[PDB]
Amino acid sequence: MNWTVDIPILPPLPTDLRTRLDAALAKPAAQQPTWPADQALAMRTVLESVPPVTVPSEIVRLQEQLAQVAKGEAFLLQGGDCAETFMDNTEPHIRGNVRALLQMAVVLTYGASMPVVKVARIAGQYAKPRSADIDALGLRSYRGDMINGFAPDAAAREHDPSRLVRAYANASAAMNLVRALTSSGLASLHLVHDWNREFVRTSPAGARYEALATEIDRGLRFMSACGVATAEIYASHEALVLDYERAMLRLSDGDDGEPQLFDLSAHTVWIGERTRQIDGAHIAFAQVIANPVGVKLGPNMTPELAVEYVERLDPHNKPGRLTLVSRMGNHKVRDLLPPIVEKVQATGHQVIWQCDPMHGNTHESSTGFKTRHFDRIVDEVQGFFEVHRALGTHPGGIHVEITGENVTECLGGAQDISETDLAGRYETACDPRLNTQQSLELAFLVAEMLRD
Amino acid sequence: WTVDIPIDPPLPTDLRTRLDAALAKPAAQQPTWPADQALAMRTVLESVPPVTVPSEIVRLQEQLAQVAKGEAFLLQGGDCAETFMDNTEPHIRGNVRALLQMAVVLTYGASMPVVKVARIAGQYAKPRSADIDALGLRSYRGDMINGFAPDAAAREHDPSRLVRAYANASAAMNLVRALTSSGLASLHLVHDWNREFVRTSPAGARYEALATEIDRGLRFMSACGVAEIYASHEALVLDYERAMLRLSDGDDGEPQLFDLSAHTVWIGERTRQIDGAHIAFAQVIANPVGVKLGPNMTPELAVEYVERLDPHNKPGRLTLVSRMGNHKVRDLLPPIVEKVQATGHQVIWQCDPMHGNTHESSTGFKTRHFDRIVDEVQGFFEVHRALGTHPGGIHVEITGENVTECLGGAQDISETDLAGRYETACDPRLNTQQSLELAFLVAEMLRD
Ligand SMILES: N[C@@H](Cc1ccc(O)cc1)C(=O)O
Ligand SMILES: N[C@@H](Cc1ccccc1)C(=O)O
Ligand SMILES: N[C@@H](Cc1ccccc1)C(=O)O
Ligand SMILES: [Cl-]
Ligand SMILES: [Cl-]
Ligand SMILES: [Cl-]
Ligand SMILES: [Mn+2]
Ligand SMILES: [Mn+2]
């Protein structure tokens, strides 16, 4: 049961982009998939002619909005599934993740009293890194459906290069739908916030959030009363699989009218903690592409390394071109983040300081499932805000993993999801996502932090 | 040469009973693949993100209702036969562009809004009059069914092309959306290409006036202080259109069935049996639908389409597409217009000046004579002016490439030129210049 694509039988790069790109891919790359270099090459030839998932004008537009975030004048909300599955690439799932992001954005916008840039982990998040190459059941590790199968069989965990095309096909389908949803009635702010006032009515913790959901309702009605009457959701994934990102590269006149290389698998991509080798091919790939890029910074980050990233990835001091995504865990952020900020801020580069309160607070549960505690996530964002407020720098955004489904993958929250509940609805293919109820809860709380 | 791509919430029972009964009618021109495999691929397509959403169809239904009511013009165009291997960024990009160029021109001459409908994101299947072609092979019936390659294997009907077709359709509709919401939207840009057309083109002097007159309205627009492209294909492979059915509510309040593989679909000359499955399928879906009408159309039968496909007198919901041939449109059409108008139904009279003017070229290729296309639209207008009806739109076959599939126009493509760039996998298309030329000419027909 399978379909079949023909292998073809694009214009040459200017010599410098040819060289820098070939130079960049020559360098070592962690966590890449093992599969025949000639099969991967067949895939990349398919992917080199397909209609792009994004287009350059949209990436330039995001670069401009992200510059406003960098400069303290807007706020970045990045969210979505931890790992996208070809299995769940369905309208109800996409719609509920779009809805979830749009809801959090209204709340965050009112809290920040400034615009929120919405970026979804969607339309390409089909690949993850693995600390160990053999998993709990002695099997080859699952690396995301761009690589192998979540199914726990020896045959499913084989790295299949055809999943490159299967990943693009799913990606541009989900993107088509995202485009359609965000230009439909789903985007209307008044519609989107009624979903939030529903949440307050039906939630156990409605009381904690009702005053604010009502303040927002009055802000929206205030708009209408003044004579006002859409949405932009950008695509992002971790750029982990260089074969994929290579194929999706397209050449176009850029911010300066000279030809640049845009990675059109998404609008923005981030290198993760296990792949940010400073002299590696990931970081060097990031130096050839025009896209906004981000870098995960965990607890072993030094102010001086952080600065080297800033000087390599933001060579031209383009505010908002580089995002630095902090994930230290709550007990470490207040101590570790300030020195990094002070030294980076001192260079004169305007980075976006994005908080990631998820990948620093995971812990195996007493049930066998890997989970995260709501109260620890809150604490790190809070701690992240405390540190930026102390320094006078901009808390530029968050980076959360969520679904529009009432899964039970994270503890606590309004539902006091306990360790014996994490088995009732553990849908995720990788890390524990906050269900929709905990998504909005956090958005409300982060909105409170944004206020004064 | 190829690679295998692996694979791995029902509708209400009262709508399936209705639907299963409608689809029990006889369907022409259908694939001959095993129903169990078809059923597997359908179950796949039953769960994928839709190519369109109901709010866009309800929205199109609103815009088309104004075409019927006389206050807007329908521009429908694109490739004759989409192929998976030409479904590329440049090709999509130049068909979007060409279609935007024609719409600016037509909007000015019509002095009213122009709905833009592309043949794209699903136009992967054609009927065939003979199931053995001139190579003595099973005929090519579109990439949704089999392969353009001459050989027994390629020509076998492959139901996994249902999925490959949807994939190509999504990827292309995702790009059209990106394109229409970026710089390509901008009129002053789209028309600056129209003025490259006039600079380069040989007939430049024939169109320099109107091109300048428009550039001045655009500057006037700007001085005074001051895009949607819909998708459509012929609904042919019914395993596809029915797997792409989704349930939501529209202009009613009750939940309707939409076919979310496109925004509007039409039923071809060879599938419109009043009691066949295709007409019965259009009955059931909420999408705007069109029906092709050739020379052997009784004024009586046009009316039975109107009663069967516009049962609730919704203007624009039904379009009737003239495809008579220039030599026949002026005489064969008027009685059809009359008989339908007198029924109290508002429909879109749309002109297809191509699918009935295809003449074999002395050099082997099937082609079309520019002067005969232009002349059928012209005669199509002369009818409607004479009858006081609304010339509702054109349905046209174009590409953004400089192919040489049609005869005449600016470049004066001749019997021997057809071999230069005959790139269509089916009918011959007006190249970029001829699409624009025709656009200017139809603007003058619309002129006050
Ligand atoms: N896709 C090519 C690079 C490339 C990109 C765009 C081009 O126009 C040309 C070449 C690679 O992976 O090496
Ligand atoms: N059009 C090519 C490549 C493609 C694959 C998947 C989706 C879109 C395009 C094919 O069908 O083989
Ligand atoms: N998600 C399914 C269906 C699908 C096919 C092709 C494109 C998009 C979705 C798959 O991976 O096959
Ligand atoms: Cl662009
Ligand atoms: Cl038949
Ligand atoms: Cl084919
Ligand atoms: Mn994760
Ligand atoms: Mn045709």
UniProtKB/Swiss-Prot annotation, chain A:
GO biological processes: amino acid biosynthetic process; aromatic amino acid family biosynthetic process; chorismate biosynthetic process; protein homooligomerization
Protein's UniProt keywords contain Manganese: yes
Catalytic activity reported: D-erythrose 4-phosphate + phosphoenolpyruvate + H2O = 7-phospho-2-dehydro-3-deoxy-D-arabino-heptonate + phosphate
Keywords: Amino-acid biosynthesis, Aromatic amino acid biosynthesis, Cadmium, Cobalt, Manganese, Metal-binding, Transferase
Keyword ATP-binding: no
Details of cofactor binding: Binds 1 divalent cation per subunit. The enzyme is active with manganese, cobalt or cadmium ions.
EC annotation from Swiss-Prot or TrEMBL: 2.5.1.54
Domain of life (superkingdom): Bacteria
Binding site for phosphoenolpyruvate: 121, 273-274, 296, 327
Cited SUPFAM superfamilies: Aldolase (SSF51569)
Cofactor(s) the record lists: Mn(2+); Co(2+); Cd(2+)
Function: Catalyzes an aldol-like condensation reaction between phosphoenolpyruvate (PEP) and D-erythrose 4-phosphate (E4P) to generate 3-deoxy-D-arabino-heptulosonate 7-phosphate (DAH7P) and inorganic phosphate.
Membership in a protein family: Belongs to the class-II DAHP synthase family.
Entry protein name: Phospho-2-dehydro-3-deoxyheptonate aldolase AroG
